[PDB]
């Protein structure tokens, strides 16, 4: 679920408030269209697409599904007790968190005008 995703981000990117990823480019947070603005935005586009795939699983709701994961000593892991839905969502989140940690963050791409620039 989103709370756990937030914690993953805190796990992998301690040097930034998670809010910094909540409104970035065309895909980071609200927004699911247009040409990705940069590498970080591409991370979010992949995450968006990943959730769309997971929602094809019967009764699978990515924003709300609680999964089993662990964040310790610099390592993010999705546990083996997850059902198909939980495993899929946990992996979408994990890969995105890892993606965020390696992508440059450009302040000029925060809170851009989605209606005008993401067509
Ligand atoms: Ca999005």
């Amino acid at each position: 679920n989103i709370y756990q995703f937030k914690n993953m981000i805190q796990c992998t990117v301690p040097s930034r408030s998670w809010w910094d990823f909540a409104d970035y480019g065309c895909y980071c947070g609200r927004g699911g269209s247009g040409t990705p603005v940069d590498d970080l935005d591409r991370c979010c586009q992949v995450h968006d697409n990943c959730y769309n795939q997971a929602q094809e699983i019967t009764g699978c709701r990515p924003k709300w599904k609680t999964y089993t994961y662990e964040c310790s000593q610099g390592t993010l892991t999705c546990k083996g007790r997850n059902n198909a839905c939980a495993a899929t969502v946990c992996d979408c989140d994990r890969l995105a968190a890892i993606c965020f940690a390696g992508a440059p963050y450009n302040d000029n791409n925060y809170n851009i005008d989605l209606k005008a620039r993401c067509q």
Side-chain angles (χ1 to χ4, degrees), residues 85-97:
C85 177
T88 286
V89 174
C90 185
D91 227 63
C92 292
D93 285 0
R94 176 176 72 78
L95 291 180

Side-chain angles (χ1 to χ4, degrees), residues 68-111:
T68 293
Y69 77 109
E70 177 173 350
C71 158
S72 63
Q73 292 181 347
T75 294
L76 229 192
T77 297
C78 287
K79 298 196 190 175
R81 45 160 77 156
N82 292 309
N83 69 15
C85 177
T88 286
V89 174
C90 185
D91 227 63
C92 292
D93 285 0
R94 176 176 72 78
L95 291 180
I98 293 169
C99 194
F100 290 179
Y105 189 104
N106 176 25
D107 299 301
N108 294 323
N109 288 328
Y110 179 72
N111 181 220

Side-chain angles (χ1 to χ4, degrees), residues 26-32 44 48:
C26 290
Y27 288 89
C28 298
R30 153 159 246 155
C44 295
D48 272 14

Side-chain angles (χ1 to χ4, degrees), residues 2-3 34 58 63 65 103 108-109 114:
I2 295 187
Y3 172 76
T58 289
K63 271 66 165 57
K65 179 69 184 168
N108 294 323
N109 288 328
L114 306 178

Side-chain angles (χ1 to χ4, degrees), residues 54-61 65 85:
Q55 61 197 35
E56 294 188 321
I57 298 173
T58 289
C60 197
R61 306 169 283 268
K65 179 69 184 168
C85 177

